[PDB]
Write a structure and sequence with these properties.
Trifunctional purine biosynthetic protein adenosine-3; transferase; substrate-enzyme complex; Rossmann fold; 6 helices; alpha/beta; binds glycinamide ribonucleotide; two-stranded antiparallel ribbon; purine biosynthesis
C-alpha cells in the first residue's frame, strides 16, 4: 500500500474525494497524513472525521520558502510518505523540494493547462469567454510550466455561469480525475520517464 500525504489550504473537497477512493477495496494507496499551511480550514475536519492525523505548518511563521518546505519535508519523512498530492495547496514549492519529490508529487489545477495558469483560473476563464474549461492533474516540475500532465477532463462553460457555478461544475470533474490519477501513479501504471516525459505501462 503506497503511503500518501495530501497538502491543503482550504475546504478539502478534493481531499475528501481522495479519502473515499483510497478507502475503496482495490486502492493501491492510503492517506497517512494531511498537512495544511492554514489552521482552522474545513479540510482539516474532513481528515480528522476520517481518522487521519493532521499538522498545520503555517508558512507565515517562516522566513522563506526553503525553511517552510523543510518543515513540511520533516513530517513527510516522519511518515515515510511515498506520494504527495497537492489538493488546494496554495503555496509555491521551492525547487529543491520539487526536485526531491520529482515524479512523486501530483497537483490538481482547475483549468485545462496550459490555459489559465495561476490562481483564479475560473475567473480568468469567464473574463476570457471560453465555452470549454476543465481541470488538470499533473506532476509538479521545477517550473510550473513543464509539469508533466497525467489526466484532464474538459468541462463546459454555460453562458449564465458565475464563478460559483462554474467552479462547482469543475470540482465535480476534479474529484473524478485526481483519484484516478493517484491510482494510476500509485499503482505504477504512470511514471515520469528518464527523459522527464510521462510514461504508461
Ligand atoms: N493553486 C491551485 C488551485 O487553484 N487549486 C484549485 O483550488 C480548489 C480547492 O478545492 P478544495 O479545497 O475544495 O479541494 C480546487 O478547485 C483546485 O482545483
Amino acid at each position: 500500500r503506497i503511503l500518501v500525504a495530501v497538502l491543503i489550504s482550504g475546504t478539502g473537497s478534493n481531499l475528501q474525494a481522495l479519502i473515499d477512493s483510497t478507502r475503496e477495496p482495490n486502492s493501491s494507496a492510503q492517506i497517512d497524513i494531511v498537512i495544511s499551511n492554514k489552521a482552522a480550514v474545513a479540510g482539516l475536519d474532513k481528515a480528522e472525521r476520517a481518522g487521519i492525523p493532521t499538522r498545520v505548518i503555517n508558512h507565515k511563521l517562516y522566513k522563506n520558502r526553503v525553511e517552510f518546505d523543510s518543515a513540511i519535508d520533516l513530517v513527510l519523512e516522519e511518515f515515510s510518505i511515498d506520494i504527495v498530492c497537492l489538493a488546494g495547496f496554495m503555496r509555491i514549492l521551492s525547487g529543491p523540494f520539487v526536485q526531491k519529490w520529482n515524479g512523486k508529487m501530483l497537483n490538481i489545477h482547475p483549468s485545462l493547462l496550459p490555459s489559465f495558469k495561476g490562481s483564479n483560473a475560473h475567473e480568468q476563464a469567464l473574463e476570457t469567454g471560453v465555452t470549454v474549461t476543465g481541470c488538470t492533474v499533473h506532476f509538479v516540475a521545477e517550473d510550473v510550466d513543464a509539469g508533466q500532465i497525467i489526466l484532464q477532463e474538459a468541462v463546459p462553460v454555460k453562458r449564465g455561469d458565475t464563478v460559483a457555478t462554474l467552479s462547482e461544475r469543475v470540482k465535480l470533474a476534479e474529484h473524478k480525475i485526481f483519484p484516478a490519477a493517484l491510482q494510476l501513479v500509485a499503482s505504477g501504471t504512470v511514471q515520469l520517464g528518464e527523459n522527464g516525459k510521462i510514461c504508461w505501462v
